[PDB]
Amino acid sequence: MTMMDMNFKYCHKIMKKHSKSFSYAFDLLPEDQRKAVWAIYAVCRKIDDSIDVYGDIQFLNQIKEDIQSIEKYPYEYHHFQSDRRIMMALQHVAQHKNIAFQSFYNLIDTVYKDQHFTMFETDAELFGACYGVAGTVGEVLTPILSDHETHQTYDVARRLGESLQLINILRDVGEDFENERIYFSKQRLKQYEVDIAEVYQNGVNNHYIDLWEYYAAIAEKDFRDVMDQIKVFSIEAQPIIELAARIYIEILDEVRQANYTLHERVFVEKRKKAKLFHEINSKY
Ligand SMILES: CC(C)=CCC/C(C)=C/CC/C(C)=C/[C@@H]1[C@@H](COP(=O)(O)OP(=O)(O)O)[C@]1(C)CC/C=C(\C)CCC=C(C)C
Ligand SMILES: [Mg+2]
Numbered sequence: 001m002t003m004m005d006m007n008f009k010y011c012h013k014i015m016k017k018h019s020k021s022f023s024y025a026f027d028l029l030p031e032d033q034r035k036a037v038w039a040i041y042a043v044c045r046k047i048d049d050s051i052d053v054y055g056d057i058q059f060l061n062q063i064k065e066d067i068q069s070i071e072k073y074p075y076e077y078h079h080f081q082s083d084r085r086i087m088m089a090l091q092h093v094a095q096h097k098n099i100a101f102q103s104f105y106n107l108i109d110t111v112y113k114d115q116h117f118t119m120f121e122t123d124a125e126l127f128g129a130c131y132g133v134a135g136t137v138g139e140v141l142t143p144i145l146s147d148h149e150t151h152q153t154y155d156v157a158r159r160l161g162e163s164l165q166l167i168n169i170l171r172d173v174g175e176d177f178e179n180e181r182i183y184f185s186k187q188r189l190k191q192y193e194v195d196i197a198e199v200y201q202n203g204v205n206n207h208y209i210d211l212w213e214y215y216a217a218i219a220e221k222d223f224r225d226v227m228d229q230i231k232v233f234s235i236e237a238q239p240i241i242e243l244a245a246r247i248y249i250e251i252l253d254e255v256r257q258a259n260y261t262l263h264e265r266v267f268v269e270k271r272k273k274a275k276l277f278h279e280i281n282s283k284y
């Protein structure tokens with residue numbers, strides 16, 4: 001094992017630890033592509049988790065500055081300020097692939113703004129936040145998972161990322177509420193006559209289920225639209241991306257089976273993930 005191998009192994013550790021669904025799928029990529037995914041993953045994770053390190057923007061600004069160094073000077077040695085192992089790996093990737101740096105900056109800005117989080121007035125705001133947290137990730141992964149990037153490739157990847165973020169929201173309603181976050185828009189909550197606090201205390205009702213299913217239907221339709229355009233991605237990545245998405249889509253059915261509970265995080269069992277892989281893989 002080289003030093004750089006050690007750097008990617010560490011990124012892999014982070015992804016396996018923190019992202020059971022995405023780890024399962026993306027680890028099936030060919031070596032050079034999965035390694036790039038691990039590095040992108042670990043960067044994004046550090047960005048997402050940065051505020052809780054000291055309680056403020058310090059570690060985040062250090063990440064941003066590290067990324068800026070890489071963008072400006074991809075072939076120079078940097079004394080990274082944040083997590084050196086992750087940044088060395090990102091830099092190695094950047095030397096070989098087009099990285100959409102502005103997409104990382106969009107994600108960072110999204111994390112900065114989350115410090116001042118006020119509920120979304122409308123679904124348009126909510127979907128805007130989904131872009132910032134996850135459409136950006138889709139954009140960053142595009143050159144990794146496709147052979148000749150076009151506007152269509154980016155668009156599909158962005159849509160997928162945003163759909164997965166909406167599923168994430170749908171899984172985590174109760175936990176988010178405990179953390180003083182509600183992501184359903186004020187407009188939709190008012191229309192469906194849903195108070196999340198009241199539902200957290202008293203159990204689901206038909207109003208809440210109707211509202212949840214309204215968003216679920218959006219995530220599903222977007223998922224189907226991505227599946228229909230899967231050929232934008234490289235032949236090797238197609239079944240893997242399909243797997244990643246299907247595993248995440250299955251979370252919706254898990255929520256339903258747990259009666260839309262606001263008091264635990266549902267999950268797709270490993271054995272089910274394997275079932276989905278068999279189904280997809282026979283198709284390919
Ligand atoms: C780079 C990579 C694979 C992921 C990035 C992971 C990170 C940390 C981003 C920081 C912001 C966050 C938190 C975003 C949410 C990820 C789930 O959180 P995680 O905690 O890992 O898993 P779980 O909550 O299930 O335990 C999310 C739903 C976005 C998924 C978007 C994807 C996969 C692109 C799809 C498009 C193509 C594949 C073209
Ligand atoms: Mg996680």
Ligand SMILES: [Mg+2]
Nearest residue numbers: 168169172176
């Ligand atoms: Mg969540």
